[PDB]
Design a binder for this molecule. Structure first.
Ligand SMILES: CCCCCCCC/C=C\CCCCCCCC(=O)O
Ligand SMILES: CCCCCCCC/C=C\CCCCCCCC(=O)O
Ligand SMILES: CCCCCCCC/C=C\CCCCCCCC(=O)O
Lengths: 528, 528, 528
């Protein structure tokens, strides 16, 4: 190694941070508190313990627990040693978890006690794993016992910045989960690009060195949006809640004085509706809602409590952060409604992101605010391919750009608004129509609980619209009324307003995926 | 090139910035104003004009003018084409300028009209340069004429991120100027590391997207501390003053509402003493004084006008930025005096900087706040060596660290305070004493104008102190009185307070370098 | 390519065979007959059809049907083009079939009509396959239609002999099926090594150029033991039965005068028990029983009909053929019983096979006829590793030898007799005992239908024996009687004859794998 040749490694985020206070605190909710000095000591102890277990440079260590100090220590100790960190989506079915464990070829597994029953259905079909480390919360944690017998001194190696650091296996539509991976250089660049793009905001949505961080994202998904790295680089106080409960998170916010966090719309809705929330001070909090498509009504309800709500976009192949809503001081003067419409957009692209919209032939459509197409991006922190995949990898990076899979339009100003998914487009004859805009119109009815819209083939206009609706409790309206409910609107293309092809049907129960996302593929299977 | 393999290039700072407003302004003081859209068009036009002139990838283009929009366009167009940008220190002697021109082997030269007389002494000894482009301010600029006949469309090439981008030839003690160079990757990393480290400040010293930038640094020195790149990445309004005049800078500050700038202590003293400054509002301005050793009295005088003054450290081999003073909100409550003492320090190291202090054997002395040693650093933006140099390059990177040449001590908190230079240490017997702390003590006298302290060899205690002083107008005190003036103090090592070895001498005139820095090498030559 | 440098390719088996008669016949049972000239023409036509479909050198084509002329044409046309041939085990569960299809990344799929329902559960989760070719038997086959429109001329390419030719995904104990692959060189060497080792037999078990071949092995398992290649190299008449039915195979044997075949003990038992078999002439037939552990009583019953029965050993990682029973003329004089005992052995190793037996430390135990150990082999036709596997691949080739997984002893003469599996050994205290020898002893009882023996942990003697038995119809004997039934025998180690640790249990139904092999892993799960 040439000392004059600098490698961008994860250890430089921890030992060469923006700020470091040895008496700043790390809090595991109502369980444990220590300082940054103790946190560094524990990272070195964990490196020693891993080295004793026989974890070499190329090895893979799989982690399975909640949000805690242990996960934060794994986010650092494992990559610095040179090993790979495999975050396991504990919400997948045990068959898919077994598939990802086999595909990644883990050597050690750190599994929380509460997830032991899952392992009891899978353990007989695992070959690569040689050690199971059972994580507990009170006193009998094997992780704590392993730490306790190791020294707080360790000389972290210097290797190439292109060595892989993390993998986490997103599940999309392929049939088997696809493994995405990142390197030390990519994570370091992601932390500094996002800190530079949104830490430099004028006044509204900025993360600074006086914030108190607390994740409300599962932290095995996408590195928790890269936020633990950014928060530890800034040397801010961090609070970890463990298992998400709406009324324990509210207590943590009130008592630890959390100012910055991030979640998905469902958790935000659960928090704002909780009985204790009504008697709480929220006007210091800056939640980031980047899970999926922040609704405007939820944004309006969160704005009336004086919460800095804004949306972001990421994809789990992309770092994930690609775009963030940032409001100019001219826009910070509008009323709630216009602000709600601005804050719920996909947002403008962050530093070092290209973000074009193309058609099926990669033609780079104009940014006029109306024309829709699929977003293709280039960024310093994208996965080159899928792990152990060839054809899907080629379909991902087709034409020299990473294909996101979302259909959106971009304003002249730069604001992006995702309209639909590429696979959910209705190919009626010779035009493309979003199926998302139809679902919410049916959702506006007083006797519908959930709407899923798919497309059935039809000889002359190709695949046409078809709506599957589940009615509410003690509500019974025939499909004829529902057909006329949507016909009341105007301003649609093709035949008048697209009326005679709806063919709405009433469904007792709608198939959902393991996580809870509506499964529009098997819906096509059982309806076709 | 692999599209999935991202290269960190300068064109990504311009076309993938943090923010971009096409109607944001670039102002050349009282001469010209255009917008960011026009600025991008002019960058493409300049790329076209350079391509027509025959500037290939490896070529070098030398620039010689003041701070203007033209220099900002050269900071971008030349590196993107692939060529090298050579900034010429217009304050060196024409012999040294000729040496640097010959050493760099420039092909084109862009020289301002006012610097033409300098060229008239040098032009007969230049072989490599084939074109001279004369820059003017009113209407007959050849740069403007070259731009006017070129199209605003250009496809900038994609090359390796390790291609050299800039060189500027620092002059130290070697005898000939030494050429330092940086690459695209290093400049991109410098812009994002500094933006992340000081844009994320809580409240005090932060550069954000609502600032108005105006350099007061020569902009050929060290890339103007990297600040034009950071300011154009943030998409802020920029004001360029041209030739520094104290009362034109004040008018620019008042009228364009500048909030962020950077200079050296002499310019700040000249501004604060100007008659028009007294009737001006300064409480929105955040000058950064990182030239050399911000005095505490100047800091105190600037703090009473409510100016956010803070210091930084750089070296012209180092990017340059290495450390910045950043105050915690606990420290933003002290009175002026304690704040003056905090703001005039060298400061804490920025993100991704290592910054140890070692002895002559590279032993990494402790950080106790008292022990002094030479600072050695590792950072992503340091020159690997000197251009076309071998032995000096080896002396620079000795022991795997870049040697700065400054002697400082570091607190436990992290604050650095530079005490002296390595070459100016007095090697009295077996201990090292700073010669800087003695000079200011003599400066406190009422009849001394300037003090320079060097060291004469002496058999038993080695090199010993020796002070050369120039008296004021109509002041005549013999060296005996001056010897007793310093003896009044206490708390020094060695023989009592170091009294019998001063041997102060009175000098009519003190030799100064070309820029204006006291020349302690020839002072030794004429006194030894 | 150097013409003087010979590459061992599969096309040389077809175009440079031992013998070639253009009027020799290929028979698809009661469906089709053509000659070897037509067969060569059809191979060239299929090469043309595959080239039109866009199958390049690296592509994979997956085949799913019965034993037919189409499978024989796929055994040649696909490898010669350079593509990979993926044989799909149609007897696995559709989940495992989907896993193997995804893992192999097939481009085309040739699937028989009868296997279409299986595809109906899997098709929605397949991404790589772009064409489905439906095979039928009467007139509407898409394979026949694709052939009919292509020319019978094709120039087969010359490539490296180390290019992969076939893959078929064995399923063992890992939890997911493991993919094994072979090259052109390995298949050519396998065909010539086996032809040289058993074609040169003195009189008994020899395949010569006057035989009539007919497979009774699924032909997707292990290349049908490499026998179609050997039979087409010799240019003999070949009969393909399609779907195995006991009374259609007997008709084929009687009418086409088949002399050489190969099956597994179950099919041989089904044939010898069929009502039509009793009135048939069998004294020209040379079935090879190499499926799993030819029983001695079945061998004795097949010997009384004057059938040349002998056993072979293979493993699906090994070519497969490793050993064959070959009788010297001295041994061809013993009565049925001694001949039955000789013919049911694993046999002596074939040409170019090493075949040691080692212990757990790879110590190469002696060949005394009593000492047992695991067989480790070296041969020219073994898979280097598992496809896309690292740790299992290392466990397979541990110590420089391929580990078979079987425990056997070898006589001084050279005869091998497999006693058990490595994973099924009972680790009673400090000795290893085969669990297979116990099962047949219990099977000798008049009121037991099937016995499975596993091992339960026990503190002082480690894992101990445990027998699970299912009783016959209208038979009810308690476990106490069964315990005494086995105690009647003698000559066993450890405690007397291993009596007090049996702990036999009665089970209503025993878990079986997908193919029909007893699942001793889940039996441990539900009993432990
Ligand atoms: C101050 C900067 C810190 C905040 C950065 C913004 C947080 C990122 C929010 C938007 C990106 C959304 C990422 C999640 C999408 C992937 C889906 C998932 O893994 O759950
Ligand atoms: C918001 C960040 C922008 C401000 C960054 C701080 C500016 C840098 C000031 C301290 C570094 C001093 C660099 C000059 C030292 C080299 C000497 C020279 O070339 O003149
Ligand atoms: C004249 C030589 C032709 C006969 C060669 C002998 C045939 C091979 C018989 C013994 C090998 C058994 C191979 C099957 C074991 C693998 C299991 C399977 O795939 O079904």
């Amino acid at each position: 190694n040439d000392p004059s040749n600098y490698q961008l490694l994860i250890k430089n985020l921890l030992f060469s941070p923006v700020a470091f206070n040895p008496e700043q605190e790390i809090v595991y909710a109502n369980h444990r508190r220590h300082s940054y000095k103790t946190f560094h000591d524990r990272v070195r102890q964990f490196a020693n313990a891993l080295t004793k277990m026989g974890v070499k440079k190329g090895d893979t260590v799989a982690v399975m627990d909640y949000d805690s100090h242990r996960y934060l220590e794994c986010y650092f100790a494992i990559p610095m040693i040179g090993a790979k960190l495999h975050m396991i989506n504990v919400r997948l079915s045990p068959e898919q978890i077994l598939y990802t464990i086999d595909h990644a070829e883990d050597d050690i597994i750190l599994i929380h006690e509460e997830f032991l029953p899952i392992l009891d259905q899978i353990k007989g079909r695992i070959d690569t794993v040689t050690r199971y480390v059972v994580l507990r919360d009170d006193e009998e944690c094997e992780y704590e016992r392993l730490l306790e017998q190791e020294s707080t001194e360790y000389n972290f190696p210097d290797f190439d910045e292109n060595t892989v650091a993390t993998t986490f296996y997103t599940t999309g539509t392929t049939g088997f989960p696809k493994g995405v991976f990142f390197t030390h250089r990519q994570l370091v660049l992601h932390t500094m690009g996002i800190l530079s793009t949104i830490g430099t905001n004028a006044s509204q949505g900025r993360l600074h060195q006086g914030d108190i961080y607390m994740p409300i994202t599962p932290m095995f998904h996408v590195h928790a949006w890269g936020l633990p790295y950014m928060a530890t680089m800034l040397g801010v106080k961090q609070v970890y809640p463990g298992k998400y409960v709406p009324d324990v998170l509210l207590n943590l916010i009130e008592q630890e004085k959390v100012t910055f966090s991030h979640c998905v719309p469902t958790i935000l809705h659960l928090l704002l509706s909780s009985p204790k929330s009504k008697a709480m001070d929220f006007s210091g909090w800056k939640v980031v809602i980047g899970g999926a498509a922040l609704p405007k009504a939820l944004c309006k309800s969160a704005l009336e409590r004086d919460i800095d709500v804004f949306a972001g976009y990421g994809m789990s192949e992309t770092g994930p952060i690609l775009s963030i809503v940032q409001l100019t001081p001219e826009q910070l003067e509008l009323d709630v409604d216009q602000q709600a419409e601005y804050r719920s957009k996909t947002g403008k692209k962050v530093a070092l992101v290209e973000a074009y919209i193309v058609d099926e032939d990669m033609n780079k459509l104009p940014h006029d605010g109306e024309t829709a197409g699929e977003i293709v991006v280039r960024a310093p922190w994208l996965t080159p391919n899928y792990y152990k995949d060839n054809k899907n990898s080629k379909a991902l990076w087709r034409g020299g750009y990473l294909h996101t899979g979302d259909v959106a339009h971009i304003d002249d100003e730069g604001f992006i608004k995702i309209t639909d998914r590429v696979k959910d487009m209705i190919k009626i004859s010779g035009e493309w129509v979003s199926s998302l805009e139809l679902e919410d119109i049916l959702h506006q009815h007083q006797s519908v609980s959930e709407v899923a819209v798919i497309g059935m083939p039809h000889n002359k206009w190709g695949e046409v619209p078809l709506a599957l609706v589940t009615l509410k409790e003690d509500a019974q309206v025939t499909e004829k009324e529902l057909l006329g409910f949507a016909k009341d609107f105007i301003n649609k293309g093709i035949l008048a307003r697209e009326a005679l092809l709806l063919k709405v049907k009433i469904v007792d129960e709608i198939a959902k995926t393991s996580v809870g996302k509506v499964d529009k593929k098997e819906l096509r299977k059982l309806h076709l």
